[PDB]
């Protein structure tokens, strides 16, 4: 029934009882485990042209409202009872309902708290929630997004935030941010199939050009936003350069590193995920925190299908790239990550290294064990892409399951 | 599309479907409700000592399954030899409750077990395993002889050869043949007065057991442990491996001249000895196997895990790194040098070893071979991706499907 979770570094054991509260199924079965898969095969988020079964929505709604009143220690109170009645009344008559701002704020924080792949959840309680449901056009979306960025960036002293646009509605198109992140570097396919810039952003870069954007020709050209109001073609918006904080990359002791002309933006803001609260779905709810150095130094800069700078750095370090056994890749990666940390610290921009991050996550696991009897966590995503076993989370067994409120993937709007 | 798991490789953007998982007849620990894939020891395979004879009906089906696998492998499925072998197995079980494997069947089953091991990154070599049949072994002393021969053949003066030695299978009511040590070669772990451990903390229990059994302990950081070998229904007997048989490699760094002064070392032969080999229902409680090391096993896990030798800080201090702050990446820097030292020293001593880059590239080739040969390959992502430089290797970007296929190697309870 309840899984026994062990930490092999400390010898300690715990029992996850929270997983029982899971109402949504993952991709695994007793026959085979598909935990290493990035996206769901079916756990997607099918269209919403028709209203969801009132019974199902109503049960998810009640559960959420129940969750909310427990949080404010007012369960069973008169307000709790009236709120449930309001929800019942609205669903029965319209097939849907609406959240109160306070509930939305509670729901957003819970979704982050329940995100199995986020290593920064110890900060889950300090989330600035912007209510953007009052939005009715792509232009208005652009204004909200610009305010989110200004606030979140805060001159380098990053602050976690989320902006919530209008929920999905039956038979009506969704509000969507076509970009996967609010700030991304263009990826231009060139003559021989190669790519200048970020290979991960080729498709979105092309859509922007298709929709009237005048493309640059650099390796780090910040893309424009393609914002979509319900049932309307997406509109193009260029972000004001002064709002997009960037950090030039240099190395503490390797003078030549800066000559590589590398840089990265300060604000990591996922904008293509769906936020689900009490059965309601928010198709556009960009959120941001701050980077963990391995995301830039290891994945973005060193992944083979990304900037893939490992070899260049290796050669500048005059390493023996003749054989794998010289561990030249491992050596270059460490320096690149060091350069990232050094640079962000120099530019006074918030950033956390993987050691500090994983240590904070272990604390979070403990806090959650006492507060809720468990913590859904995805081991493959929590453990850093380098020096895995050198961090504490590597030696910690984890249970992964889906709790709601939750952040989920959704189909690309095109 | 296809009604099987869709597996993607994000580096190459290629896709494959695993149809082999359809052949799994043993449930894992996961459910649609929650994933328990990270658990090291999930109460699943766990071959708990099953005294009373196994349900003849369950054993038979497992036996028939294996014989079918065997005859399919030699392309004679449906043949007269196949149906007669099936009749012979069912008959033997009918009158005795169990059955026995032909030599070639044992060889086939042992290789399939390795091939089927989800956590092994060295499976591209699966077909070249040397299977030593020791099913005639009748004493703990004889177990020692067999083990010494295995160690000698496998070590082969540094040019290691994969091998497995299979002792008699489990029998009803009769005690099991067991090797108490977790590996044929392990360093002692001595509990200290202040509560610390000198040597390898992972072997404190086995070390204490060896002592309780007459072993006169040493006081070093790398004392090779003796073997506690147990024949059916007898207390375990203690055997000391002749030093000349245990090849070790002193560790030195290619450029950091002081590293050699650290006095670190490791043995060349990795030989797991506490796992159970299950073939067609039959259980081989004692069947030690060995290959060769992947450098991160020694350099990162054994030497740097907090609960093992934990030498990260010592080396960082020697490298004069800032160990007072995480952002200096002192742990990362020291780990890399320790791993390089391991590769350098083994190469120097001409002892077989494979670095994590070479190993993972070879495992990718293995996955492709297996996709064509069986429609998939059971792999445990968390165990396949190396403990350092994870995303710098190709396997990190390869999604994997984990499941249990038989023949298989399984964990079994400690005999004490
Ligand atoms: C405050 C600093 C934060 C840090 C250091 C952090 C770090 C991380 C990391 C390392 C990942 C995995 C990234 C990857 O491998 O692509 C992740 C994933 C995630 N984070 Fe956070 N996070 C932070 C804030 C937030 C906030 C504010 C939210 C939401 C309100 C959030 C929601 C998520 C979600 C839902 C995922 C999974 C995204 C996916 O599946 O691609 N995180 N986070
Ligand atoms: C030829 C060289 C070989 C290499 C490089 C190799 C490498 C590895 C590695 C790195 C692991 C995980 C180690 C750990 O984290 O503890 C492993 C696990 C395993 N290997 Fe291999 N292996 C080799 C040969 C063999 C052989 C010959 C067999 C069996 C006939 C085998 C069976 C297994 C099994 C069953 C496991 C999992 C044991 C456990 O769960 O602790 N390997 N191997
Ligand atoms: N620390 C974060 N909030 N990360 C969000 C995901 C960022 C993504 N991994 C990137 O490299 O851009
Ligand atoms: N390469 C191998 N055959 N490894 C088997 C496991 C050895 C174990 N990881 C050790 O470091 O002792
Ligand atoms: C710095 As070199 C090119
Ligand atoms: C090099 As030592 C201290
Ligand atoms: Zn699973």
């Amino acid at each position: 029934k309840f899984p026994r979770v062990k930490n092999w570094e400390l010898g300690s054991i715990t029992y996850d009882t929270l997983c029982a509260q899971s109402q949504q199924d993952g991709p695994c079965t007793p026959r085979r485990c598909l935990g290493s898969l990035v996206l769901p095969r079916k756990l997607q988020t099918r269209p919403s042209p028709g209203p969801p079964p009132a019974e199902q929505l109503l049960s998810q709604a009640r559960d959420f409202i129940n969750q909310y009143y427990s949080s404010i220690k007012r369960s069973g109170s008169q307000a709790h009872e009236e709120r449930l009645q309001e929800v019942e009344a609205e669903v029965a008559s319209t097939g849907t309902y609406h959240l109160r701002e306070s509930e939305l704020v509670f729901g957003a924080k819970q979704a982050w708290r329940n995100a199995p792949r986020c290593v920064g959840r110890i900060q889950w309680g300090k989330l600035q929630v912007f209510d953007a449901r009052d939005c009715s056009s792509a232009q208005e979306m652009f204004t909200y997004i610009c305010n989110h960025i200004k606030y979140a960036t805060n001159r380098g002293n990053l602050r976690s935030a989320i902006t919530v646009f209008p929920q999905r509605a039956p038979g009506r198109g969704d509000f969507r941010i076509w970009n996967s992140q609010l700030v991304r570097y263009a990826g231009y396919r060139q003559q021989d199939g190669s790519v200048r810039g970020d290979p991960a952003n080729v498709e979105i870069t092309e859509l922007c050009i298709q929709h009237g954007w005048t493309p640059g020709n650099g390796r780090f050209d910040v893309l424009p936003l393609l914002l979509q109001a319900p049932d309307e073609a997406p509109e193009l918006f260029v972000l004001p350069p002064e709002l997009v904080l960037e950090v030039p990359l240099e190395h503490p002791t390797l003078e030549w590193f800066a000559a590589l002309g590398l840089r990265w933006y300060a604000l990591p803001a996922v904008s293509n995920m769906l936020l689900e609260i009490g059965g309601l779905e928010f198709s556009a709810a960009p959120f941001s925190g701050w980077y963990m150095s391995t995301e830039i130094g290891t994945r973005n800069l060193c992944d083979p299908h990304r900037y893939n700078i490992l070899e260049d750095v290796a050669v500048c370090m005059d390493l023996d790239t003749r054989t794998t056994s010289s561990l030249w890749k491992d050596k270059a990666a460490v320096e690149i990550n060091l350069a990232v940390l050094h640079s962000f610290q120099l530019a006074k921009v918030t950033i956390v290294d993987h050691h500090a991050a994983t240590v904070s996550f272990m604390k979070h696991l403990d806090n959650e064990q006492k507060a809720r009897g468990g913590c859904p966590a995805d081991w493959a995503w929590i453990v850093p892409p380098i020096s895995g076993s050198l961090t504490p989370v590597f030696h910690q067994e984890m249970v992964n399951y889906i709790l709601s409120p939750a952040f989920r993937y959704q189909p690309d709007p095109w």
Side-chain angles (χ1 to χ4, degrees), chain A residues 181 184 264-265 268 270 288-292 295-296 300 306:
Chain A
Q181 283 185 39
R184 305 248 72 197
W264 204 268
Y265 51 89
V270 181
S288 63
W290 52 79
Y291 272 117
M292 168 166 81
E295 293 177 272
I296 305 175
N300 298 351
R306 297 299 293 289

Side-chain angles (χ1 to χ4, degrees), chain A residues 7 9 118-122 292 294 352-366 379 381-396 398:
Chain A
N7 178 298
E9 171 184 355
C118 189
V119 70
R121 285 179 282 163
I122 194 169
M292 168 166 81
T294 54
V352 61
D353 67 72
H354 49 295
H355 298 294
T358 57
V359 167
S360 75
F361 189 68
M362 289 306 293
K363 287 172 166 48
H364 175 68
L365 286 182
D366 185 86
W379 197 91
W381 283 63
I382 299 298
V383 172
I386 50 164
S387 312
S389 66
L390 307 188
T391 70
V393 292
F394 182 94
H395 308 286
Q396 175 66 58
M398 306 176 186

Side-chain angles (χ1 to χ4, degrees), chain A residues 256-257 259-260 312 315-316:
Chain A
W256 52 259
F257 198 87
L260 293 178
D312 294 346
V315 174
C316 291

Side-chain angles (χ1 to χ4, degrees), chain A residues 195-341:
Chain A
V195 178
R196 186 159 162 69
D198 194 338
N201 304 322
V202 172
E203 193 174 15
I204 184 66
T205 294
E206 296 180 357
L207 289 172
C208 295
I209 294 177
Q210 206 143 308
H211 285 269
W213 180 56
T214 293
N217 70 303
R219 299 182 71 185
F220 306 85
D221 296 328
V222 174
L223 290 163
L225 299 171
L226 277 179
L227 305 180
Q228 180 176 58
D231 304 301
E232 290 298 309
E235 288 169 46
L236 190 75
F237 297 86
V238 176
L239 288 168
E242 64 279 7
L243 271 50
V244 186
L245 187 53
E246 297 187 79
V247 178
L249 304 190
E250 81 183 19
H251 192 283
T253 63
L254 298 174
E255 56 113 6
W256 52 259
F257 198 87
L260 293 178
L262 301 177
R263 55 199 282 122
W264 204 268
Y265 51 89
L267 192 66
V270 181
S271 58
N272 60 175
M273 291 190 76
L274 183 152
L275 169 59
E276 176 277 305
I277 302 171
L280 299 191
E281 294 173 339
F282 298 92
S283 58
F287 58 79
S288 63
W290 52 79
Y291 272 117
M292 168 166 81
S293 64
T294 54
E295 293 177 272
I296 305 175
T298 305
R299 303 306 304 286
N300 298 351
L301 291 173
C302 298
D303 270 5
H305 55 296
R306 297 299 293 289
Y307 281 73
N308 189 37
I309 71 171
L310 224 45
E311 184 158 4
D312 294 346
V313 183
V315 174
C316 291
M317 284 180 76
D318 185 27
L319 301 178
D320 192 328
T321 66
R322 297 179 292 182
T323 174
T324 62
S325 54
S326 71
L327 302 187
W328 60 270
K329 290 189 177 184
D330 314 73
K331 286 183 174 179
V334 170
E335 299 307 336
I336 296 167
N337 286 81
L338 185 70
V340 172
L341 284 166

